[PDB]
């Protein structure tokens, strides 16, 4: 959803400070009869403050919408406040307020940051600087690449001198969980954005083949690996393409010894400018088996097990 | 009930400050043997403070009274305090204390104000001035007309540039709910007491015919519409008449394009001084169908639905 | 689903007797690796009997399918037995077994018949002849028209000398309920398929305008009225058209004073052979208001209420 | 309610056999649109059998009626069957069917008989003859006087060689309990309708003064004492009068040493033909204290206690 | 129990300050092997502080004692603190510490004072002076007479210009409730220890005969009436005698028009110095009925009821 | 455990009929003081019948034994009866009774047969002949090889024209479940003990690599595959060896293209007569990768997924 679904602008000494919406003001808005000429204008509930532009009605779950977010939960407020604390430290101007708020961000990524922020064991609970950087990345107001320190978090299922593998807890989310109960997905972040040895790539690749053999190692190109069911690569190919198509934009293919062969092809075809069908095609054909970089990984792990 | 059911007067530097009753002192009073010459005098429980005049015994629910209020709930205290905070800001004199306290007010209206007052999302939670004005109106110590800002509240089911429609939550009240579980009623307040366009009246009327076709649009004449079941107009006619009969008094017929035809007649007959039977009669006859002000409203909404 | 999802054929003295599937045999089948040349052949579980042809896998809900039926419930068995008791009384031949079983029937309609069949207050609980006729109609092996006696049932919300209005209890179904919790739909059956007076049509039409004003009176053309939300007429138009398109077929427009104006147009355009767009178009335009057959109905009911 | 609220007549070999109503047929009826010329005619639900004449709608509790009976409980069926088993043994004729069914009987009295009938410890559970006589008395098709054997039952709180005192369990009834939770009432039946000694009257009177001092000993004149709160004598006086007024009739004043002084006066004034006001008046005046028949009773019981 | 069951002495600047026992130190003590020469000496648990003299083992409930108190409840601590706050304000000396602590007090009376003390509606919650006086009376370190203000409290069932009647809530006590579930007892305190009119005595006596006819009005002679079951007067006679026998002492017969005839006799015989048998005898004989002071009380109340 | 833990012999007309033990007789036995010369003799409880020889005390779980069985569950009885129904159909003689009962059988295998036997969907519920054969195999009184029809059962996770793969439900067993909650194990039975094509072996092998990559395909040599965690092969190697060592014996290596390479080696070394260390050694070394029989299986399944 747009950042304009969580807060509204407010002039306060030349600078713009962002304020969170009360869920009841949103509720009033969803029952309000607005003019087509005001759908893009914030709404005054009179009783519970300002509400989002009524043109975003589809972002909030109601009795006939389960495709939006659960704005009546406390997580909506926590997430809104997180976005506000971030935007407030930018001192946006009377000309970006619009561009900034119309930005679409990942809700699951923000709620995941709230979970990190509130855990006193998480480093984010203690560093407003790290928390800030983590959030700016998520709301698209940063140039940095998400790494382990600034990751959205989740449950750690594998740690290496080079990477940290997380199990995404979207099914358990309060704000906008995933409805498909068969959902399983993992994210691998780079601990440090520096040179990674072969022994550390081999340690990870081995873990991925043995522990997650039914998963395809892909990437959305922003610096982290995404471990998803093969029966889901298609949908990912579509979303990443649609995104690339938005030229109006950098992509990181990541380590080719880790990314699934077909995904690397599909993505390189895309980075070369090709069409969708041309790309998608590559993703389906049983390409020529590349020279396995780390052979034996499977057998070794298997033998260790046997002891 | 009388305001004297929630508090008692107390001289404190020439001015009169009102104090709330402890529920246990009320309980003692209900078991007390008082003299007919003291029924109008406050009662001393000796143990829990001062209690209301024993002549009001019928206002409190007991084992043989369900026609009163649940004074042992916390809502009784919250409501009492609300009344006290209001009266204390008037600095009543040694001659009105009686007149003021003998005033009958709507308990459901006060408990509704407590619910608004305690919600941090409601503007009343932040404006003691607005809260004050809202309460003074309710306890009859104000000249202002209840509008959206100062309304008793409830659940907002429709908002317009001109009105706000609330669903009265009386069934859920702790202090003195409605016992009839088949009860449904809505209130429409004017957002601003100023000139209202036709397009905004049409937006409301359309909503009332489509969404509440089994409801009659009436008014008790204090500036707001009351949406009630047709099978309840009779009782309303009686209560509003009885009230008018109390000449010892202004009435607002409100917009004639909104108020149910028969109700407007019944009320105008009343504002002209007529009798009850003369009025009630008008309310039952299938009067001549007036020239529909906004024709087509029904069909339009219906067609929108179909898309 | 196809009737072949509930039972399988079995030669037994020249005649074909149908046997119900065990849910565990279906489960085995859903885990079975079948050859593309056997997808249309019944499956042997070896342990729990015969299962349906694996080409119907999509009819049964699993961890990745919620678009099918809950075959593990007792209702699956009850429904299967109902279908079997019906087919067994036909003595199908070695040439129809296929045609008969490949017939698609409404599961909600069958489960509704089980609910009637098991209630000792329902006449079906006592007439295997009426139960039979009711089921044959539902499984498409009958020429008769569903009337009140043979209806699928539900909760009776209005009864007339001529019609009976039922509230469809699909949300509560065990076998294949409706997932959309905002679903509300009613069915009106003719008590007797004979001449219906005007006073009895007027009694019904009045009830439909007052009690169900937000509902469009339509029909799927098999002899009964379907009362659905206007925001659902579109989907109905599609399903009825798709069905009509299946020329490889009779349609009953029903009483034109009852069916919604636009639906009658949409359907007559269809009975004339027209295209989809040509028809659908009629359904959206605010046609010229036909001469109201029973005027005043609204006001009368309203006045009765007021007493 | 009328006996016609539980069953309907049916010719079966010159005699009339009564059949119980299905609760669902009653429900259909309550939603049926009947003609004013058929309100007194049984109703055909088409689906659940015959229902009572729609003119009795007020006898059944619905969403807007709590003044009737809970016909959907099993007790409705049990009670209906009890009434049927009784009427069926009378072989009513083609001319009384109406008179018999229009008879108003006490529902609480019948449900009380069902409770006795189903307890294997109660003699009624074993004597269909005694059960029959008990029911005929209750439905007004008998000349006998209710005594201990044929009483409606309840909880036995005192037994004497001459009487049995029962605590009426109406608050616990399923079919038509009493809604006023402050209700307490007892009934005293004569074990044998023969000469009762003074020592046995004294034993009872003593128990009534010591154990039930806040209760007035009255009677509805059908042979049993009714022990009710003094704050309820008024309502009883009205109901017994209204009943007496129905000349279109015998009354038993019962033992004058037991019946409350004022009640005996009120009732004798009634048996003499007087008006209501003339009677009611007697009930309120502090009449001249009659010569206490059994003096000392109080002190004795008190002294026994002290040991 | 002795006050020495709740606290122990401690020299602190010439004065003696009392400290509460930890329940765990009591528990240790109950498992301790003490010498017969130390049974009267406080016990050191080493781990949880000082405990009471092991000679009081019988005051605490254990697995084989239900005749003591539940020292592990919070009420034990609250009660101990109440006793401490009282004794600490006396500044007892190095010669009374023993006499003071060996004093037996009523636990139910103290726990009742804790309940008053903690209720913010009770005046004791606000007056440490009144709380103090109330406690000193209870622990026998005061000359004052318990009146309504300083009563042990309970549920108020009747209030008069002169008296307040309380229902003792011993069954609900945490520290040392009454085990006999059939227990019911009331206490009547004098609001003011001054001249009481006849009309106010008559108001009370009337309430006692009508509302509590099975109760004997007695007194333990310390200024308040005790309303107990006649089947309990005997036990009371014994306890009051045993107490009187403790000459090593003033008694208040109270109003003779209120106290049960026999109790007044039994007590006057005692105040004259007589033996137990001589007294007890008076309590059983059906003495000559004294000239009823307020005749008619019964009939009046009865007549009021009837209206 | 020994079959002598479930029943005892009894001469009845030259033949020996087996009777089940009452759990209470076992309990008595576990508290009985027996002589070392009777430990092998059945025990008479006197009160609950005959119990097992006290030398088997270790087979029953008590307060200090969790290594046995839960003989107090109904499953103990059901299992005992199953064993009895089997032995009774053999008509054992006065010379085998001992040999037969001292036979150790798998309890989990028997309880699994009870679960099949009681399910009306399972073929065993209908064939006492098949049930019999299945049980005789399990208790070691049969020459037949367990196949799908006669398998111990469980949850079917894969079915082929040639095999059926079951998930062992030992964790859920009542009689003697597995305590290690991390336990997962599957069994693959041959549907028919006949020639199996390559396409059907390939279908299975593909399923085993994709769906169970962390599992080693082994066998205990009685005709079925056992799918266990690699971290469990060691324990299996020990149990199968210990068993082989019991020469006082046939082994089926099964299809070498399916059994894990190392397991085939370990087992062939055993079938050749070798020692334990010699065998175990083979199981650990990373043997030379044999020529993959069905290459590509992995990639194909993976590609199918992607569609
Ligand atoms: N309802 C939705 N649920 C999930 N994704 C959506 C939804 N709607 C749009 N998207 C897609 O979200 C993006 C892909 O999913 P995300 O996980 O949100 O991307 P991402 O968070 O940037 O990826 P990472 O974290 O860098 S590996 C595509 O740009 C969008 O097409
Ligand atoms: N127990 C009662 N319950 C509800 N109304 C009562 C009751 N007793 C008296 N009334 C009536 O209360 C008034 C009408 O109901 P209310 O809703 O309280 O009026 P109101 O609150 O002033 O109306 P609004 O808010 O201006 S539309 C009549 O003056 C009284 O007759
Ligand atoms: N999953 C589905 N749920 C509901 N309807 C479906 C579904 N799939 C197909 N249909 C449609 O079912 C038919 C319309 O719905 P139904 O209620 O089943 O028809 P119907 O039961 O014959 O109508 P009646 O009872 O005569 S008014 C259309 O022929 C189909 O397109
Ligand atoms: N809803 C009602 N509840 C109780 N009584 C009613 C009700 N409606 C009418 N009655 C009265 O019922 C009768 C008195 O109550 P009942 O207890 O039913 O009489 P009764 O059962 O004949 O008295 P007994 O058993 O001989 S002492 C009066 O004739 C009626 O006025
Ligand atoms: N376990 C016990 N339970 C109750 N009373 C006891 C117990 N043991 C001794 N007593 C008696 O307690 C006294 C009478 O009971 P209490 O109610 O405690 O007296 P009291 O509290 O002084 O009376 P009041 O309050 O002035 S009317 C007698 O002096 C004792 O015999
Ligand atoms: N407590 C125990 N739990 C499991 N197995 C045991 C236990 N005690 C002994 N065993 C072993 O049981 C055998 C192997 O386990 P099982 O599964 O019972 O064999 P099995 O049932 O014959 O194998 P299948 O069914 O033919 S593949 C070995 O012969 C024994 O060493």
Coordinates of N, CA and C and ligand atoms in Angstrom, one line a residue, chain F residues 67 105-106 108-109 146 152 170 176 185 187 219-226 236 238-240 242-243, ligand 6:
Chain F
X67 N 9.7 -48.1 29.7 CA 10.3 -48.9 28.6 C 9.4 -50.1 28.2
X105 N 7.1 -60.5 19.4 CA 6.4 -59.9 18.2 C 6.4 -58.4 18.4
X106 N 6.2 -57.6 17.3 CA 6.2 -56.2 17.3 C 4.8 -55.7 17.8
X108 N 3.8 -52.5 18.1 CA 3.4 -51.4 17.2 C 2.7 -52.0 15.9
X109 N 3.2 -53.1 15.4 CA 2.7 -53.8 14.3 C 1.2 -54.3 14.6
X146 N 4.6 -59.9 3.9 CA 3.7 -58.8 4.1 C 3.7 -57.9 2.8
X152 N 0.8 -53.5 7.8 CA 0.4 -53.0 9.1 C -0.4 -51.7 9.0
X170 N 3.3 -44.4 14.7 CA 3.7 -44.9 16.0 C 3.6 -43.8 17.1
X176 N 2.0 -49.0 22.8 CA 3.4 -48.7 23.0 C 3.9 -47.8 22.0
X185 N 9.0 -42.1 10.1 CA 9.4 -43.3 9.4 C 8.3 -43.7 8.4
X187 N 7.0 -46.8 5.4 CA 7.2 -48.2 5.0 C 6.6 -48.3 3.6
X219 N 15.9 -51.7 4.3 CA 15.0 -52.8 4.4 C 15.5 -53.7 5.5
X220 N 14.5 -54.4 6.2 CA 14.9 -55.3 7.3 C 14.8 -56.7 6.7
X221 N 14.7 -56.7 5.3 CA 14.7 -58.0 4.6 C 13.5 -58.9 4.6
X222 N 12.3 -58.4 5.0 CA 11.2 -59.3 5.0 C 10.2 -58.9 3.9
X223 N 10.7 -58.2 2.9 CA 9.9 -57.9 1.7 C 9.4 -56.5 1.6
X224 N 9.8 -55.5 2.4 CA 9.3 -54.2 2.3 C 10.4 -53.1 2.6
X225 N 10.3 -52.0 1.9 CA 11.3 -50.9 2.1 C 11.0 -50.1 3.4
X226 N 12.0 -49.7 4.1 CA 11.8 -48.9 5.3 C 12.5 -47.5 5.0
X236 N 19.5 -49.1 12.9 CA 18.8 -50.1 12.1 C 19.8 -51.2 11.8
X238 N 22.3 -52.2 13.5 CA 22.5 -53.0 14.7 C 21.4 -54.0 14.9
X239 N 20.2 -53.5 14.9 CA 19.0 -54.4 15.1 C 18.9 -55.5 14.0
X240 N 19.2 -55.2 12.8 CA 19.1 -56.2 11.7 C 20.2 -57.2 11.8
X242 N 21.9 -58.0 14.8 CA 21.6 -58.8 16.0 C 20.6 -59.9 15.6
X243 N 19.6 -59.5 14.8 CA 18.6 -60.5 14.3 C 19.1 -61.6 13.5
Ligands
LIG6 N1 12.0 -51.3 22.1 C1 12.2 -51.6 20.8 N2 11.7 -50.7 19.9 C2 11.8 -50.9 18.5 N3 12.5 -52.0 18.1 C3 13.0 -52.9 19.0 C4 12.9 -52.7 20.4 N4 13.5 -53.8 20.9 C5 14.0 -54.6 20.0 N5 13.7 -54.1 18.8 C6 14.0 -54.6 17.4 O1 12.9 -54.9 16.6 C7 13.5 -55.3 15.3 C8 13.5 -54.2 14.3 O2 12.3 -53.4 14.4 P1 10.9 -53.7 13.8 O3 10.3 -52.6 13.1 O4 10.1 -54.3 14.9 O5 11.2 -55.0 12.8 P2 10.1 -55.4 11.8 O6 8.7 -54.9 12.3 O7 10.1 -56.8 11.6 O8 10.5 -54.8 10.3 P3 9.6 -54.7 9.0 O9 8.2 -54.4 9.4 O10 9.7 -56.0 8.3 S1 10.4 -53.4 7.6 C9 14.8 -55.9 15.7 O11 14.8 -57.3 15.5 C10 14.9 -55.8 17.2 O12 16.2 -55.6 17.6

